[PDB]
Amino acid sequence: NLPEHWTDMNHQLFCMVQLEPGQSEYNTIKDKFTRTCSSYAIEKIERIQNAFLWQSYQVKKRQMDIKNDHKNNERLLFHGTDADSVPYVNQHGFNRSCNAVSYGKGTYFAVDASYSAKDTYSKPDSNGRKHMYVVRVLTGVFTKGRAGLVTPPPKNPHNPTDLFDSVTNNTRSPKLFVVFFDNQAYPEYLITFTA
Amino acid sequence: NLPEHWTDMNHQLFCMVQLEPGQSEYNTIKDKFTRTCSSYAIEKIERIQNAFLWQSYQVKKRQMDIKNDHKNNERLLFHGTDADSVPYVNQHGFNRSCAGKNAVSYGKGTYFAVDASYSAKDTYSKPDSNGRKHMYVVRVLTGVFTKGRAGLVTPPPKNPHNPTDLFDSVTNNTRSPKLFVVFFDNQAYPEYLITFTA
Ligand SMILES: Oc1ccc2c(c1)sc1nncn12
């Protein structure tokens, strides 16, 4: 049950689709980036059409909507990666087992494109190209994280197995989210850009 | 997709169901266990009915069935754990970030044994304060596998020149597999808990 904005895949399950500059989809995603990254040059934006990653994400999304009994569990975040990790993330998504981990041993997602735009995350390749994903993240109900977490803390010490969905640096004004489970993040767009 | 032999859960998402000796379900697990663990005695066997884990598991199984060529992708395997781990596993399954380092390491992931005897070692199924040991019977998507290596944090590529086309799991020995390692969430469904004692 594959989204509208996706384009036909000739019965295949995976495709990177280069967006057309000037059209609505490219303009929406470019504007999310340029809010904090208007000094960088965008070379291209690719929609990630990964049927498997999508299915697994959508299943986790329906589970978290039931669990939390409301539907505001999704946020759009950024993730800066090096050139070598791009093929893996496109095909297999984010992997905590693969950078400071101050708020737990999960995958890190930035609210601001500027945070992910740092060279330590979006590592320039030899040609100077940087890579950042626009990611759908199931942040759900979150709390402050701390070093050493391997899962989010429980929502009550009385019930140790009922967990928060993610952790953040700051609950009132978050700038990053950590998630600790595969398939809590769908990599939706890859931005190729330069300094 | 909840299987029709599961007990009704009255719109609940999790339930442990104690099995009865003399039923085929209990007896087939007992026989699988006693095959290599005849010196131990089973206290009880519970069916694990976790709606969410089962759904995420079945999605990965259908994905691996499409990906691989008519492969038998799923094995029934054993997992020894400590009493402190049973509530997390029952509710959230098997988390590689919590895995113990195995005495013979074939990668940094969750280990599953062919033989109950392996899982029955006190190192895995640690005796609780009452002398009870705990072993899961687990549906595992082993898929297409190769000999593992201690450095692995994911299964290796089938081909070094295509680094993203991966083996599903690794084993200690591909001619005679005794353990499997899996590197991803929802690639194992904890189906039964065996409580046993000396
Ligand atoms: O401590 C970290 C580690 C990784 C990381 C961040 C903070 S923000 C970000 N965007 N992409 C990757 N990352």
| Ligand 1 pocket test, candidate residues A75, A99, A107, most atoms within 8 A of CB | A99
Q: Do B164 and A97 touch (CB under 8 A)?
A: no
Do A110 and A79 form a contact (C-beta atoms < 8 A)? Answer: yes
Distance CA B2, CA B10 (A): 13
Coil, strand or helix at B17: strand
The contact set of B with A (CB < 8 A) is: 13, 52, 55-56, 59-60, 63, 66, 87-88, 90-92, 95-98, 108, 153-154, 163-164, 166, 183-186
Min Cα distance B63 → chain A (Å) is 7
Angle at B146 between CA B143 and CA B152, to 5 degrees: 100
User: Which chain A positions have a beta carbon within 8 Å of B13's beta carbon?
Assistant: 66
Distance CA B101, CA A122 (A): 32
| Ligand 1 pocket test, candidate residues A78, A107, A176, most atoms within 8 A of CB | A176
3-state secondary structure chain A: CCCCCCCCCCCCCEEEEECCCCCHHHHHHHHHHHHHHCCCEEEEEEEEEEHHHHHHHHHHHHHHHHHHCCCCCEEEEEEEECHHHHHHHHHHCCCCCCCCCCCCCCEEEECCHHHHCCCCCCCCCCCCCEEEEEEEEECCCEEECCCCCCCCCEEECCEEEEECCEEECCCCCCCEEEECCCCCEEEEEEEEEEC
3-state secondary structure A29-75: HHHHHHHHHCCCEEEEEEEEEEHHHHHHHHHHHHHHHHHHCCCCCEE
Q: Do B87 and A161 touch (CB under 8 A)?
A: yes
Give the other-Cβ count within 10 Å of A128's Cβ: 11
CA count, 13 A, side-chain hemisphere, B185: 24
Could you tell me the residue ranges of all domains in chain A?
1-195
Distance CA A95, CA A181 (A): 8
**What sign does the CA torsion over B141, B147, B150, B151 have?**
negative
B32-37 contact pairs (CB < 8 A, 24+): B32/B76, B32/B116, B32/B137, B33/B78, B33/B116, B33/B135, B33/B137, B33/B194, B33/B196, B34/B116, B35/B115, B35/B116, B36/B115, B36/B116, B36/B117, B36/B118, B36/B120, B37/B116, B37/B117, B37/B120, B37/B196
Residue A156: strand pairing partners: A159
Q: Do A97 and B59 touch (CB under 8 A)?
A: no
Do B136 and B120 form a contact (C-beta atoms < 8 A)? Answer: no
**What sign does the CA torsion over B150, B155, B159, B161 have?**
negative
